[PDB]
Structure formats: C-alpha cells, structure tokens
Amino acid sequence: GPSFPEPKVVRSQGGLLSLKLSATPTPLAIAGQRATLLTYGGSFPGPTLRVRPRDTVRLTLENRLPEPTNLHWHGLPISPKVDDPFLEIPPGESWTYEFTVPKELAGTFWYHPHLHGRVAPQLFAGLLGALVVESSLDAIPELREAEEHLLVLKDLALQGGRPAPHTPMDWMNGKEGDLVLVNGALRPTLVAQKATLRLRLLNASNARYYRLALQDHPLYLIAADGGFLEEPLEVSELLLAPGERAEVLVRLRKEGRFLLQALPYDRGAMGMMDMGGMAHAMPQGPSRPETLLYLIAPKNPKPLPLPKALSPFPTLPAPVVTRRLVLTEDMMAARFFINGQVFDHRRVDLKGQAQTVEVWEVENQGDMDHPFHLHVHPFQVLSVGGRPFPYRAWKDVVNLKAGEVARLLVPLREKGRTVFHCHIVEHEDRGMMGVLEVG
C-alpha cells in the first residue's frame, strides 16, 4: 500500500453521503500485532467521511456492541435533535442520523461515541473517525497544489490482544497508552512528493496531549477546530489537546529525514507514592517524548508561496450575557465538577437565546489541564490565561492549564438541549459535564 497509511475515504455522491456503518468488535492487525478492537466500518480509525457544504448526510449506525452507544458529530454546528447526546442505541439496534452540512463551514471534524458513563472505554477501544468538509478555498493554488494528508493522533494500550481495561487511576487522569500511533500505524514514514504539505490534524486520544514539533521546521497554522484562520500563522510548535483539530502547512526546506515529535508536556496527571508515612498523590510530570512519524523531503524542495489570506472571520453581534463556569476536581474520588456540580441529564444548567452572542468565562481551578468542549455552538477564543489569542477562527475545544481563565465569544445557533464538558473523556464520564438549553 502507500508508504503513508490513511483511513479509507467515503465521499458524498451527487450531494448525498448515504452510508451504513456498524460498531463492531473487529479482529485486525495493529502495530505489528493481532488485536480485537471496537471499530466503525471494520477499520481503525473508522473511515473518513468527506463532504461539502449543503450536502445531505444520511448515516445509519448499527450497534453490534454488547452495550448501548450513539454518535456525537464533534464540532458540527447542526441541531442537537440530530447530534443528540442523550440518545441511546441499544445493542443490536440501528439509528439513522440525517442532516444537511451547513453552508458556511470548512475544516476537519470527527465522530465518536457520547453515551454518558461509557465514552472512555468505547473511544479508547477504537471507536472514532474523521469528517472533512471541503471548501471552495481548497481551490486556491497555494492549497490545491499542496500534498494533503490526514493525521489521526490516537494512542492505545493492549492486554491479551484487546484494549487494556481502565484502572481507578485511569478514571482520575484519563487513560494514555504506550502505543502512540498515527492513523493506527506505529511511526509510519511519509515520503513527501511535494515541497508543501497540507496536514489535517486530529487528536482523537482519550487524554494524551501532543505538543507537536517538526524537526528543523516551523508549522503554518491555517485552520483551528472548526474553520480557517484569517491568514496563516507561523508557530514553532503546536499543542493539540484531546478533541482539538488543526490544519497546518509544512514548507519543506531541504532534502533529508525530519522527525515529527510529540515533545514532553506536563498536563498534570498524578501518581501515588509511599515514602515512609505517606500514600499521597504525586505529579507524574511531563510525558516522555514520542516520535509520531518520519518525514522524508523530496529532492531540491521548492515550497509554494503561502496564501496571503484564508477566510475573513465573521463580525459578531455584541454579547447579551456573560457566564462563569468554574472547573474543580476531587482527584482521590475521581470526581470532577462544573460550578460545584456533577452532570445530571434531567437538570438544565444554562438557558440561552438562539441567535444571540454570549461571553463564557471558563475557569480552571483544578491542577490538571482540562480541555473544555461545547457541542453545537462553535466559539471564538478571545483570551486564555489573560493572554489574547493570536488569531480568529472557530473552535469547539479550548485547553485550560491549572488556574487559567478562557474567555470565549459564543454565538448560540440551533435551538434545543445540548451539553458542554471536559474532553478528557474519563472526566466527562465521571461528572464533568453540564446542560445548555437554547430557545
């Protein structure tokens, strides 16, 4: 096959992407070993769905798992009556999701389970895939002539040929695995044929962070979770928290082999130790560095010029309300809270008005990083930790280090009941989620 493994793509046909997927335990070859994973469409990752604005998606999910499941269309600004976080598909049953892709939309999105209390083991086991919304912007020569690839960043641990079970410490920290994979492959080689690469990046891990850096090269950020920036932004490294996406251009500078690494990063995970009068929690410290893939540049690379502009960011109406959401932890109990409460599906926490804009101040009063996610309503990050964000783009996950406050501009779009929660999915399962109702 191609030196660089990427999930199979399924494209809409005549404006319709009609597809039946099954969620099923699947024997497969993974990183040189045989294992049984839980997959969509018989593969890990699941197939990449590629659509355009205004397309119709008709996706029938058949549940062949021994437990209930459902889908979250992560990042898509569609109705929560379709992207329904409360829906349960029992074992053996099917459900058809049908929606129209919004007209003003572009970027890399993804699908995965969202059945409260069961997300972490289901996602860890292999249930996820990407969804790409193609844009007319993709036709500008600076992008069209680039070599494009999707990189699904997901780690895994195996035990007895199956995903390793969650331990109590996993429910506290969020589970990370020793197999740090790209598109389900172990340190693949990307042999570039063009000097400019366009890479769509997805962190589909439960809890692992990727502090991305390519040896000897900067990255040019061109899209965040939910859409393009206004112009490219040069960065020396790029942190991708669980659930986040980004698109970057890479401008290969000379011939050779360059490592794409996940550099050491301390997200505040904890261990336990006993030193003589102890049995207390202790920081794990930063992750060990990982090589994600080997990038081989072509002969005499002459990269394209960068695009001068991408997509202007919408001018938003003045906000009509300010909200405060405070995140806290009870680590030893593995309980996690928003404004002092755990999730209750029957309780509405915030009531907002469709087509108004709100300011949300999300404050992390815990010691761990928490990546905060809001369904249905993409947001503009104004600042984090008192630092203004260096670009305007739509995001749907924002990472908060210990103590940091994120200020978000949140236009409320589709009416209905939806959720916001930490995207360390173990924390969501353990209570760190709330309910927003838009009317």
What single-letter DSSP state applies at residue 332? G
- With CB under 6 A as the contact rule, the residue among 52, 72, 198, 392 that binds ligand [O-] is 72
377 marked as part of a ligand binding site: no
Phi, psi of 143 (to 5 degrees): -105, -45
Q: Smallest gap, in angstroms, from Cβ of residue 419 to Cu ion?
A: 6
118 binds ligand [O-] (CB under 6 A): no
Cβ distance to ligand [O-] smaller for residue 174 or 307: 174
Q: Is 421 annotated as a binding residue?
A: yes
Candidate list 149, 200, 208, 373; residue touching ligand [O-]; CB under 6 A: 373
Residue at token pair 């793509």: 9
Phi, psi of 387 (to 5 degrees): -105, 125
CA distances (Å), 15 to each of 56, 59, 104, 358, 417, in order? 6, 14, 16, 34, 29
User: Counting Cβ atoms within 10 Å, is residue 293 exposed (0-12), middle (13-18) or buried (19+)?
Assistant: buried
Q: 52, 114, 208, 377: which one contacts ligand [O-] (CB under 6 A)?
A: 114
Give long-range contacts, CB 8 A cutoff, 24+ apart: 217-220: 217/250, 217/251, 217/252, 217/253, 217/258, 219/248, 219/249, 219/250, 220/248, 220/249, 220/250, 220/251, 220/306
Cα dihedral 111, 232, 183, 298 in deg (nearest 10): 160
Contacting range for a copy of itself; rule: CB under 8 A; set: 131-139, 144-152, 319-327, 332-340: 319-327
Least Cβ distance, residue 318 to a copy of itself (angstroms): 8
Kindly indicate which of the ranges 82-90, 213-221, 315-323, 388-396 contains the residues binding a copy of itself, using the contact rule CB under 8 A: 315-323
CA distance 424 to 44: 20
Nearer to Cu ion, 407 or 427 (CB): 427
- The answer to whether 217 is annotated as binding is no
- Considering only 74, 149, 392, 430, the residue that binds ligand [O-] (CB under 6 A) is 74
Q: Is 116 annotated as a binding residue?
A: no
Residue pair 59/48 in contact (Cβ under 8 Å)? The answer is: no
Q: Which two tokens stand for residue 56?
A: 């119709």
Instruction: Tell me if 114 is assigned to a ligand binding site.
Output: yes
Residue 166 among known ligand-binding residues: no
Q: Is 320 in the site for a copy of itself (CB under 8 A)?
A: yes
Residues 286 and 263: their CA atoms lie apart, in Å, by: 9
Please list, in sequence order, all residues whose beta carbon lies within 8 angstroms of the beta carbon of residue 233, skipping any fewer than 6 positions away.
Answer: 220, 221, 222, 390, 391
From the CB of 369, what's the least distance to ligand [O-], in Å? 17
Check residue 154 for interaction with ligand [O-] (CB under 6 A).
no
Q: Which is nearer to ligand [O-], 113 or 411 (CB)?
A: 113
Sites for ligand [O-] among residues 402-431 (CB under 6 A): 423
| Helix locations, 116-216, DSSP H | 119-124, 141-144, 168-173
**Residue 145 burial (CB count, 10 A):** 13
What is the contact surface with Cu ion in residues (CB under 5 A)?
74, 114, 243, 370, 422, 424, 427
- Any binding-site annotation on 72? yes
Residues that bind ligand [O-] (CB under 6 A): 72, 74, 114, 373, 423
Residues belonging to the binding site for Cu(2+) are 72, 74, 112, 114, 280, 370, 373, 375, 421-423, 427
Residues belonging to the binding site are 72, 74, 112, 114, 280, 370, 373, 375, 421-423, 427
Residues that bind a copy of itself (CB under 8 A): 320-322
